[PDB]
Write a protein that binds this ligand. Structure first.
Ligand SMILES: CN1CCN(c2cc(=O)[nH]c3ccc(Nc4ccnc(Cl)c4C#N)cc23)CC1
Ligand SMILES: CN1CCN(c2cc(=O)[nH]c3ccc(Nc4ccnc(Cl)c4C#N)cc23)CC1
Ligand SMILES: [Cl-]
Ligand SMILES: [Cl-]
Ligand SMILES: [Cl-]
Ligand SMILES: [Cl-]
Lengths: 125, 5, 125, 5
């Protein structure tokens, strides 16, 4: 209905609770492997944030996998920063990580992160 | 909070 | 780090995608039964929105259940309105449903919904 | 959108 009222903080409160579940390893259903590193997560959050994960977990075979191995060229710290951003809306973008963050965001298909990385690089030229 | 969206 | 940047719309975009997955029945992992009615959902979203579901799915036995039956006194339309609110931040509160919505929100432990229901009732007195 | 939170 068009007669709805809206709770402004609801979406951010939901994301805060999803991040608390992730931190406590509650109902995490996939391990993302990035070279030597493993990251536990919720497939629905990954799909909701990334075009690559959306494609992976809507596949009729890959939806059932409990482990996903990323391309060996993917930087684990870049992935970690992006996983934190997925669960918090906060991106720890720094001079020392921007190239890895941008390359990882391009691979994961996260257009808004790619956009801000491009803008921060262009400003330093 | 609540608002008219 | 305290040097993070934040994407304002991220949390709402995540919730919109979780609702699209729910609508298409993608990776839904629980059926909530409310009398004659069945509602498919994601346990993590339910826990993130409701004190009752948070308690249920953190229980070492109940976390594994694929079906949860609610108390027979719970109104299915009241539950439907609250499930939509969980996935959208929008509450379809109307004169004809407010009592059922408030009672359901008290049972599910959704304090902000209970608060607005109380305020709307008090205004009509 | 991006902001300083
Ligand atoms: C096809 N296409 C699609 C889109 N992509 C992307 C790109 C980016 O960038 N981001 C991003 C996020 C996120 C995503 N997610 C999604 C979407 C839609 N829908 C839904 Cl349901 C979902 C979920 N889950 C996605 C993406 C791509 C591909
Ligand atoms: C114990 N206690 C707790 C709280 N509760 C409630 C009440 C309301 O109201 N809401 C509500 C939401 C929501 C919830 N969720 C949560 C919380 C915290 N953390 C986490 Cl992790 C989670 C998840 N997932 C909850 C609640 C209650 C009980
Ligand atoms: Cl597997
Ligand atoms: Cl993004
Ligand atoms: Cl079961
Ligand atoms: Cl609430």
């Amino acid at each position: 209905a068009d007669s709805c009222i809206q709770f402004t903080r609801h979406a951010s409160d939901v994301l805060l609770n999803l991040n608390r579940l992730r931190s406590r390893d509650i109902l995490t259903d996939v391990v993302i492997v990035v070279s030597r590193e493993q990251f536990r997560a919720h497939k629905t959050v990954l799909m909701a944030c990334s075009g690559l994960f959306y494609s992976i977990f809507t596949d009729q075979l890959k939806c059932n996998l409990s482990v996903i191995n990323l391309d060996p060229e993917i930087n684990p710290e870049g992935f970690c920063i992006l996983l934190d951003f997925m669960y918090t809306s906060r991106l720890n973008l720094r001079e020392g990580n921007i190239m890895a963050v941008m390359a990882t965001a391009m691979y994961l298909q996260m257009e808004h992160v790619v956009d801000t990385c491009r803008k921060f690089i262009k400003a330093s030229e | 909070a609540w608002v008219i969206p």
